[model samples]
Structures are given as structure tokens and as C-alpha cells.
Target: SEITLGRFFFERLHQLQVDTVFGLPGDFNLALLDKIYEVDGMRWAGNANELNAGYAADGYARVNPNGLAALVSTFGVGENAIAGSYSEHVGIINLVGVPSFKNISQTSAFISDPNTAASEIDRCIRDAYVYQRPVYIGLPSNLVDVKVPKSLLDKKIDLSLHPNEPESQAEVVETVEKFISEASNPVILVDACAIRHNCLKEVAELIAETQFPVFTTPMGKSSVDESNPRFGGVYVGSLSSPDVKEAVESADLVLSVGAMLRNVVEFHSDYTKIRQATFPGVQMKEALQVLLKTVKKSVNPKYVPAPVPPGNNDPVSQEYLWRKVSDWFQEGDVIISETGTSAFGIVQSKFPKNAIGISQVLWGSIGYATGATCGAAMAAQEIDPKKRVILFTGDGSLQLTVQEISTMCKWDCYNTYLYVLNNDGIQPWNNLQLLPLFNAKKYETKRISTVGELNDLFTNKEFAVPDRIRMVEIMLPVM
Candidate 1:
């Protein structure tokens, strides 16, 4: 009664109740997509670009009320195409691909993106992607689904499903659904929760109902189900646009699935700010509390769901992201993360597939990226040579870890790639509605608008200022 491997990958996934698969259609994926179509509930959607497709899948996965699967194509092109999507989802989403079945061919060596071409040959996303993100770039399409030797296919295995996880997961889904139902303009922010539970159908349905704008943070980007009027845009760090923020703030409810608060998964303990109507004592919290007060006012004790945690920092507030991270059961690669708010951002957030999140968790450390890069990169080389190693560093953290650039050059392992979130200074402060919070007259607005070559310190050699208050002046800023 069982289907063949190729038939099974799609059939079983569909039998498990996946509704949509994200990714562009190419020769390699045609067979898989065809299989998906024959299945009862599944469908294929398109994207303008491969990268956007990836982002769409990510967003869909984040907002998924149950759990969902995302499919993307173009093995080599997908490697690059999926970068933006990968940037957003991997930690919390369970992703599989119709990769090139041709890795068995020596020509596979020429495949530039490890799945097809120049991947670390043996390394997984522990190197190919950052944040110990999991990607299933299985052997090419032709090879994967078909039958092989009994040694590979017929090994006796007991498949156990903790059916309770699905129910508790559904409870979580119902909680989110209730939030979505109550609010009219609630701009829901999602992380990796939806994909984990195969809940894309429910998420897409809710999004469809509101006619609201939909957007995602890095961990929430790309979706296989980008076919919504609510599909807004990406809102991570310097890359964010006004469209995303307005939608999120204007909403009556803020439903975050697998969510985090730092600017990126790397920012430390900083709060984002929202714009406001001028008033006597209105601060960032005050401006936001205005809408929340109204939302809370309408709370009907019986119908309204249980309270969501206060602010975006508490354990319950970030349970989705934390659970996802906690579920990352396998141990293979090294993880290097940035400092400050983002450090705790990814740490506190749930990571679905078990991944070890590095960087300090409670007290956000500053400049943890550099040494981490050097150390983790070396870890990639030493511990598991087959696993390529990389780390997520912020522009601010990179300043602290500049010493490792030399280390990177020395070891020069191909497994290492530096994914630097280059927002100048520490940009994780309150969401993109930047204004002064500390003083009424002067906002503690630290401007690190430029990163890498864009920094004035590097470009304009003349201007000089000491780096900080406590450490008595040195040529540090200039250096």
C-alpha cells in the first residue's frame, strides 16, 4: 500500500496534510510538483524571483497556525535564490527540496551551491546557512525518490509519532487564531512556528480573511504560500521599509509565532520604537500602549483567550522561537552569534529543529561576533570537516571581532562564510520607528547607518571621537 520514494516524499508529506509548497518550477522539480498535484490537498505556487519565493516560504512557515512544508527549486540557483528565504526560516521551519538527483555524478562537483555544485562537498547548512539552519538539499531529484538497495531502504525502523505534540501544537495554533480573529488591523509577526506544525493552510486562511497586509522579519521571510493580498514585505534591520512597521503597529493584536525582538536574530537587549501622537508624557511604550489598552478593553472574559505575555521579551512571549531552537536535536556544527539584543533574540526564540544557539543568552554581550567567527570557523574545520561552518555577526559585533578577520584569512576553510548584518552601531533599538526615547529633547539615537566600507570612520579619515565614556581616550575610534 506504500508508494515509491519519489511518490512517497510528496505523498506522505501531503498525507501529513501539507497544503502548499513554495519554490519556482524548473526541470528538476517538475516530477515532484506533479506528484504534489496528484495528492489530495497540495498545490504549487509561484514567485517573481527565486529569492522572493524563498522569503515567501519563510513567511508562510512563520505564520502557519498548524505546521507546513515549503518546497523551492533550482538546486544551484536555489542555493543562491534561497539565501534570503534561508536567512528567514531554517531555524524554525522544516524545509525539504527536490534537489538535483545528479550529485552521484562527478559533474556534481562543479555544482557551485553544495546541493548541486560548489557546496562544502559534505557540509550541511551548519555551514551553507547561518544559525545552524536546516536545509534538505537531498541528492538530485532523480536519485532521491526511487528505490535503492535494501541496505538503504529496507532497514527496520520504528516510526513513533507523539500525537500529543500535534494536539498541544494545535492548542497553540488555536491561541494564535483567536488573536487573529479578535483584531481588525492586527499585523501578525511570525517566526518559524507555522512550518513546524504543518499549519500553513490555517495561516493562509486567516491571512486571506483579513485582507490585511502581511510581512515578515528575516526569520519570517519567504513562503511557498505567497499568494495572499496580505503579503507585505521583509522587515529585518536596515532592510525594513515603512510598509511593514505601519501594518504591524496599526493592528489591534500582535500575533507572533516563533518570534523574537532584537533587530535581527543577532541584536542584543534593545527595544524598537514606534512613532506617536505628541502628548505630555508619551514615551515609546505609551504610544504603543494606547492601541493595546483598547484591545485589552474589549476583552470578553469567556470568549477572549488567555493573556499573551507582556512585551516581546518574556519566555511565553518568545516560546515559539525558543521551542523551535530547543527542538534542534542534532549536534554537529558550531554556532557564532552577534551581541546585544540579537544575542538573546535568537537564543530566547524557539528553534524547531534542534540547533545550538551561541552568544550570551541573558545579559546581551557586545562585540561577541569576531572571536566567535574565528573560533566557530575553526570548529567547522576541526570537529566535523564535512560540516561547513559559519556564523551570524552584526556590524556592531564585527567591530569587536575584527581580530578574527586575520584568523579567517589564515585558516581559509571553504566551509566558513561570514553573514554580517551590517546595520551601523547597534540598530536593534526599538522597531524602525526611530525617535529619541531617553531624553525629551535628545533621543539616544545612535547612528550607525553605514557598515563595512560605508562607515564614515573608514571613509572620512579626518573626524575623530573617543569610542566611549569609561575607557580613557585612545585612538580607538580612528583605528
Candidate 2:
């Protein structure tokens, strides 16, 4: 018994819990698109462009519990999207439909042989899952319907992570426990890797049970429940506020979990570091789990409350805008912040329980959040329709991929909320009329310039839990 290569590829994606496949239709991928429709429970989510498709895939990967998402596109045209996926460390299967195997060189990602097709697909997908990064799988246009052994699908992909060495794991956990017990002032730092590695449960448990002062990096924001009394604030070295800086820097021992250490005693995906000793092959999830079982609860550490800026009647300022938005957040909301002002400003805002944050801090892609919002909103709809997808993007950034908003409208993402910060240097508000064009079911748009107007919108019950796709163009001074 056998099935087409296209069928096998789509079936594998469905098995990984990827219900929606984001991509653009192309001459090369038309056959592949048909295969997606053939697979039961799999839906094709068409994007405005290839890059937005990639951005959407990244957002889907971030919210999905399986940490897997996928996109398909024609060769050469899809490279732009692949770069974004690679830059952000998103686990995405980038399936490309290319020229016939007879014409293409062997150096490319093309699959020519039926015997190797199944193994090749499994290998790329497994690597993407294991490394939390994007993997390319090129399917020649001629090979889309080529038959491969159906038995290949019977064996599931090996998605399990490698276990840590027993001796090394115990030694690292023991060292962390000793450091925590001996130090008078110990703090826990959670970061992006914690969320990427699916260790939020362990990380949260460690923070809650220990009652230690916990802080997150800008990239790590919302990984831990900011509503927790012990949450200090976002810590970004010199960029941190006075109170947050003092709370974290003044600590005698810093127990960093799932964070890339800036200055020791770090627990990472592959290794653990204690002062000068480096224990290789020690996984953070297992080590944290063992530590949670045997570790002693420490005394309550100092808690530094996040500062709330006062609202004034004057024009809306970045300071007031960011802090004010914090109060509007609901639990289980997916917050996507753009680069530059939006990303930096969002760090000042606190998040509620189960709220997830998405940004490309390392990649610093300007328009990433706009397209990502579409994907995040769709994933949210699939996971929980009640959860809202809010995007914070600057006017200039939004201009880069604003068409994706129409895609959102087309998809009927009713809970999607977009806040466009209009802060161009030349004018107080950009003339780009985003609100007039986009048409969604129960769509709404508002332009607010004064602080009072912004405050009123946040406090409004109708605006708080949106039943419509809404976009608010916020006017702010150029910074």
C-alpha cells in the first residue's frame, strides 16, 4: 500500500497538530495546495504574501503547545519567509515546491528518489521539532504525486528530547539547591528559552513554590505570570528601571532558569552552569523538575512592584500609553509587540496569567508583528476563541505588512485587536488611513490623540473584550 508524497507530507503535519497551513498560492505549489485540502482536518490559510506567511507561521509556533507550525511556498519566492523563521528560532516546516527533479541540481533540497523521500521528510521535520528552528523540505513539482510506502507513516516521528546524563543532572541540581539554600538574597530569572523549550510549567512552579523575586527579560516577558506578587519586573541589564535593577543586581545568588546568562549559575537547554563548573548534557526541564521535588522553599524575597504612570489630559505619551495598556490586558491574551518603540515600551507593561508575549527582539524585524498577529489570532481561535490577539505596532512598521490585516478580516478573527502607534517624525499622525480600507465582520476602528480618550477606550467594557476585529490608531509624539 502507498500514498502520494503530497499526502504523506500533509498527513505528517496534521499528526503534529498543525490544523491551519499558512501560505500563498503559486504555480509551483498548486498541486501541494490540493493535497492540503485532501487531508481531513487540515485547512489552508492563504496569506497576502510569502513573508507574512512566514511571520504567521512563527506566531503559530509560539502559541501552539506542540511548538510546531508550517508553511508552503514556491521556490526562490519563499526565501524571504524562511529567513524570518530562521532568525526567530521558530519551529516551522518550510515546504517548497520546486522545479522538476530532472532539471534541478542535486545540491538543492529536492527529493528525487521514492525510497529516500519518506526518510528525508521525517528527518527535516524531526530536526525542526527538536531544535525549535525552521527546516526546509523541497518537493519537486513532478514528484508531488509520486507514491511512497504507506507503512512509512505508521512509524511516528521521534519528537522526544534527549535525556540528561543521570550523574550530571544530579550534580547540577544539587549545586543549584546548595546555592539557593546558602544565599540570603536569591532571585529567579525567566527568559525566552523557557517558553520555547516548553518549560513554563516547571519554571512557574519553581517561582511560585520558592516565593523568590522573579524577573523576565524583554524577550522573556509574559513567560511567567506577571500577576504573581513575587514578580519584580522586566530586567534588561542597564535598560532596567531603578527598582528592578536594584532588586535583581542586589541578589546574592541569581538562579537563572531558561535564560541566557549575562553575567552565572545558569540552566540552559543543553547544559547547566554553576559558578565556574559547567555540567554538560544537563537538560533544564528535567533538572528543574528534580530540583522542584527536592529543593527547599526559600524565605520570601523582596518584591518591586511595576510602576504605573499617571494619566494626564495632554496628548498621549509613550510612557502613559504603555503603562495604561497594562490594565487592559486579560488573562490568556496573546500580546504581539513590534520592534523599536513598541517592543521597548511593552516591557514596562505587566501581563496577566496565561498571557503569552511574541516579539523578534533578537531578529528586530520591523513588520514582523503585523503578519504574526494574523497567525496568532488564528491559533488563538483554534486553541480558545475567547482569547484575544492584540498587536502593538508603530505606524511605519505597520505599513510594511498592513495588508495582512485584510487577511485577518477574511479569516473572521473577531477577537483580533490592533494598536497602531502613529509617531512619524514629520507629522503627529501619519496620513495612512488604515481604518477606512479594512472590512471585517463586526469591524471597528478609532483614532485617539488625548490621554483621556486612550484611558476611556481601555476602561470601556465594549472595547475590553472585543467581539469584533478592531484597529485603534493612536497618535503620539515623535520620540
Candidate 3:
């Protein structure tokens, strides 16, 4: 019953319900790629390049129910090109096939040993799942056909639950539960890790159990039910809605879950009975359930937005674009915003009910939204029949991987909508320090920047949807 080591890896991915993978083939990886084609449960998606493939896998992981995404490539040459996947913590597995074990330290073009390959694969795959980030696996091309114990496939890769933090685990749970029971106003501040750590369900359970108001950071938006009655609003430092900021600031006790905001906490609040722990979020939720007692329900505040400015047919601004997009959202849409301007702008708009927001807030990789849009569109299509995938990214970020947008020109991607924040340099960056260097480098090209042209592209008769990929390039003022 023994199988090739390559088969073992694909088997593991299939067990985790990662049905598809994206990457390109090379001389070092042809044999490994063969296993993917031969494997029964998984399908291989040949991307334009390693970079876009990595990004496609990143997007898939976020929306995939199991939170598992994978990519394949050749030796050093292939692995070297995966950009956004390495920096962004979106949970993807990077599998690279190298040279034979005999060429371990040789001056050969692609030297790699079997032992090192096995260890890297084991260690990185384990680390990727546990840390909720991307991990690379080096598989020697020679060992692609090597047989391993079939019994090894029986057991799931041991993603051991958090170790015994017995005393500490109980203390934090008890302290937080007690604080909630006593506090007149307690709010749950959720962050990105809640999703990364796969504890969204636990967070949602706690929200329902406590009936307390919940607010999320820009990094943690949509980790909980945005449409829930107790859903307060998004809290983003000074940019937060006045009502949300006031409610969070006035809270008697704040149960900050899954993250530490640099601009928050120390800015407006002090440590009165702060209870923090490093245990997995799911484990903490279980602990808190034990000592759970009846508590007074907290108040849910309304968001206070600034008075609207007079409207015109003028070009889009950062503020106006977000506000308009807010109303365009549906209940079950998957909203993805790239880092920088798009990330900041998305948080300014309130999310609709059941909307899932995906962003690389912590890792903050540029050009992530473009490639991610491909995988996300497919993921959203598979999971929610009625849901659509919408991407918001700046023109600066789009330049890195715009080729991925053409990938949506197939079936199962007609609902994909991309709104590119067309600008010169990165937005908001110019405010920090003006870069006069960009002015000299600016090129002259006949770019389409009119709303009429954009509308025609979206509503054209020749190309229609369920088969259509709508690309909206909205021009904005220079910062």
C-alpha cells in the first residue's frame, strides 16, 4: 500500500479538503507535477507564473472552508519568484521540487538533499498550519517517486492543540468572564488573527452568548456576523466612526481578542483588569464557556457619519468611492481589499450582513488583490451559490500582477468585479512625504479614464456575464 512521497503530500492536501492547487511546471518539478495530475482528489491550475500562482493560492485559502491553499514550483528558480505569498500571512503551502539528494551541496544548478527536503516539507507544512501563515516545502526531484510507509497517510498531520496552559488558561477565561458579568458596558474587539487562527466560530459563539456589542479592527473586519444586532461597528483609531469610538472608549471592560492594536489601547484606555494569553482562540473559547454566567446585555450604539457633501459628476475620491461601494454590497458577498489605500478606505465603509472581508492588514503585501481575485471568485462561487467576489485595490498594487485579471475570463467567474483605485504612486503615502521623483518618471499614454467608457465595458453586448469579467478602473485625484 506504499505510495510515492509526492502522492503522500497530495493525499494530505486532499484530506484537508484542498481540492485544487496553482503553480507552473519546470524541469525540477515535472515529476512532482505528474503526481498532481495523477492524484484523484486534487486538480492542478497552471497559472501564468509562480508569483500569480502563489497569490491565487492565497485567495483560495481565505475563502476555502478548510483554510488550506497550496502552490507548486520547480527548484530555486521557481521558488524565488513567489512574492506576495511569502510576505502575506494568508495561509498557503509552497511546494518546490529540487535536485537529487546526491547533489546536496554540489555546485550543480539545483542542489538539494532528500533528508533536507523531507525535513523542510514536514517542518514548513506543520508551521504553515500552526502559525496560520505560508510555508515552503523543498522536495527533491529524485525523491518524487520514492516510496514511504502507507500507514503514515492514516494519521492527519499533528496540528496539536495548544499545550497545557492549565493555570493561565483558566485565569484569563475566568477573569474575562467575570469582567463581562460585572461590567456595565463591555465590548469585544476582534482582530485578524481570529480568522487566521480559525476561531471565527468561537468568536461568533461568544458574541451570541454574551449578547455584548462587538467591534472589529480594520485587520479583523467581518470575523463576526456584521449584521448581528449587537454588532457595534469598525474601530480604526481616529478614523473610526464617532459613535463606535465613543462606545469602545467608554467601555468599562474591553475583551480584546486575537490582536494588539498599536494605535488603540494605549491611546485612549488603560489596563484596569487586562487578561491576555497565548493559547489558541478556540481553546480559550471552550475555557470561557465553563464559567459562563448570566450577564446584563450591553448596549449597541449607532454609527455617526459626517454630513454628506454636495454631489457632482466629478471623478472619484477616496472618501466618496468607499461610501458608494458600501451601498453596492450585498448580504453574502466576499469583500477583498488590498493593503494601503484600499485597506484604509474599505474600513471607512460599513460592511453589510454576512459579508466576509479579506485583507492582508498585518503582512500588507501590495498587488495582492489582483491575483487573489481569481482564486476568491472561484471559492466564492463554489461555497455560496448567490455570493459574488469583489476586489478593491489601488493602481500601484495592480501593476505587480495585473496579468492575473485575465484569468477571470472563463466560466464560474462571470460575477467577479474588480474596482481598481487608479492613481500614480501609492495613495496616502505621498501625504507622509512628497516624492518629487515620481513626477519626472511619469509617462504619457492614452489611458481610458471616463465613466462612460467604464460603463460601456461593463454593459457591452458582445461579452456578457457568468462569463464576463468586469474591470472598473476609477480615476482619482493625486494626493
Best by TM-score: 2
Query: Considering lDDT, which of the candidate structures 1 and 3 is the better prediction for this target?
Result: 3
Clash statistics: count for each candidate: 71, 0, 0
In candidate 3, what are the lDDT values of residues 1-479, reduced to their tens digit? Answer: 87787887888787777777788778978877778766786776667788788778888888887676888877656752234444334567767676772221111122255434434455555666666556656666777888767777675577764553567555554455455545666667887656666667767777766666788888789887766777777888777778888888877767776663411211011111244333333343334344343322322232222111013545556776677566567677779998888888888776877677778766676767778887887777667656778888887787677656555553336567666676766333321111122221211112235544444443554432333445555677777
lDDT of 3 at 193: 59
* Lowest lDDT block of 10, candidate 1: 467-476
lDDT of 1 by residue, 1-479 (tens): 34434444444344333355656676666665666765676655544344444433433332232223345555565642233323333321223344443321111222223222212222232222223233454435654445423232233222222222334333333343455445555554544423332334444554544344555454343321333445654445444446555555555655443344311111011122222211222221212223233333333323322211122222222223223332332233334455543454454333322132344332333544444344344334433454434354555555543434443443443444444443334433232121122111211112222222223322342221111100001011211
Q: What is the lDDT of residue 355 in candidate 2?
A: 92
lDDT string for model 2 (1-479, tens) is 88899999999988888888988899888988998878888888888888888888889888887888988878776654456566456788878888883121112255878778888988888877877777767888988888888788889999888888889987787667766666776778887878887888898788766767888888888888887777888888987888788888888888887765423578888788888788888888888888888765433334332232145568998888888888899999999999878888988887889999997877787789998898898888888878999999887788777788888888788888988888763233342355446656577788898989998999999887758888898888876
Runs of candidate 3 with Cα error greater than 4 angstroms are 80-89, 101-127, 149-152, 158-165, 260-285, 288-314, 381-385, 410-412, 423-467
lDDT of 2: 0.80
Better of 1 and 2 by TM-score: 2
Off by over 4 Å in 1: 1-161, 165-183, 192-212, 217-245, 260-337, 340-363, 371-479
**Residue 1 C-alpha lDDT in model 3:** 81
**Local accuracy by lDDT, each model:** 0.37, 0.80, 0.63
Candidate with better TM-score, 2 vs 3: 2
For candidate 2, the per-residue lDDT at 410 reads 83
